């Protein structure tokens, strides 16, 4: 038999950690229904931020707030299903997912997104910061939401999610307004870029686009982009702000 040599030679520059993205979700259930399904159901996530004002949560004996780890980061949780971002897929492998309890709703298929709880958010930024500091390849655009990786079969973490706040806190990507505007103007005057340029520019940001984009799809896409970066409205409707935002990110957060 033969024991392994962990001390003689260690690689330094040419290597990274496996995890790249941090993805965000709303459970869509009350806590108990959420621990159950993320611990024994058919999915899971690495971390779970409860909504402290949840009867089930308090019932379970929690004063809260807490953050719960359901799967250590080393391992692979199931939250991202069929995915894609930044030229990848099956992001379950390569990401860390966070689930926050928030009973957003699909009602065939009108939607309803409750505001999050503050503590819940202060927790989140706290956690999310702890991750980012530990994965160096988790650049700002890689802090994403299911909706972005799973367009438009998913819509968490939903437009009630204070990204910009998180940006402000160092977490995830956001545009310099100046640069946004510079595009808005340019677009209003010089008109708008062909779909071609757009899709592509959407791709570059990260979005996993199919070969061929029905406007039907497009909607889903814009929608998603919007609930993230322009949640003031997320009608799948090609705007100039919306489009300006895009290039404003692609300017600041480029290849």
């Amino acid at each position: 038999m033969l024991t392994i040599d962990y001390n003689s030679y260690r690689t330094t520059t040419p290597y990274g950690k496996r995890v790249r993205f941090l993805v965000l979700h709303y459970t869509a259930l009350d806590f108990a229904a959420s621990v159950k399904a993320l611990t024994t159901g058919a999915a899971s996530a690495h971390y779970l931020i409860p909504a402290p004002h949840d009867p089930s949560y308090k019932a379970a004996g929690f004063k809260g707030q807490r953050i719960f780890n359901l799967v250590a980061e080393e391992d692979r949780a199931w939250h991202a299903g069929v995915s894609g971002w930044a030229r990848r897929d099956n992001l379950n492998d390569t990401s860390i997912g966070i689930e926050i309890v928030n009973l957003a709703r699909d009602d065939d298929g009108v939607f309803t997104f409750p505001d999050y709880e503050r503590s819940q958010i202060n927790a989140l930024k706290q956690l999310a910061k702890n991750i980012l500091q530990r994965y160096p390849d988790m650049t700002p655009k890689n802090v994403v939401g299911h909706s972005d990786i799973a367009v438009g079969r998913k819509s968490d973490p939903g437009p009630k999610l204070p990204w910009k706040e998180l940006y402000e806190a160092g977490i995830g990507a956001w545009y310099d307004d100046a640069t946004r505007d510079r595009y808005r103007e340019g677009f209003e005057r010089d008109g708008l870029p062909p779909r071609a340029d757009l899709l592509e520019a959407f791709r570059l940001y990260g979005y996993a686009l199919p070969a061929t984009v029905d406007d039907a799809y497009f909607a889903s896409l814009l929608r998603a982009f919007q609930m993230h970066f322009r949640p003031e409205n997320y009608d799948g409707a090609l705007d100039v702000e919306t489009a300006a935002i895009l290039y404003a990110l692609n300017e600041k957060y480029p290849a």
Binding site: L38, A42, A43, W78, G81, N90
Partner: peptide, 4 residues
């Protein structure tokens, strides 16, 4: 949330 949701393997693949």
């Amino acid at each position: 949330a949701x393997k693949x």
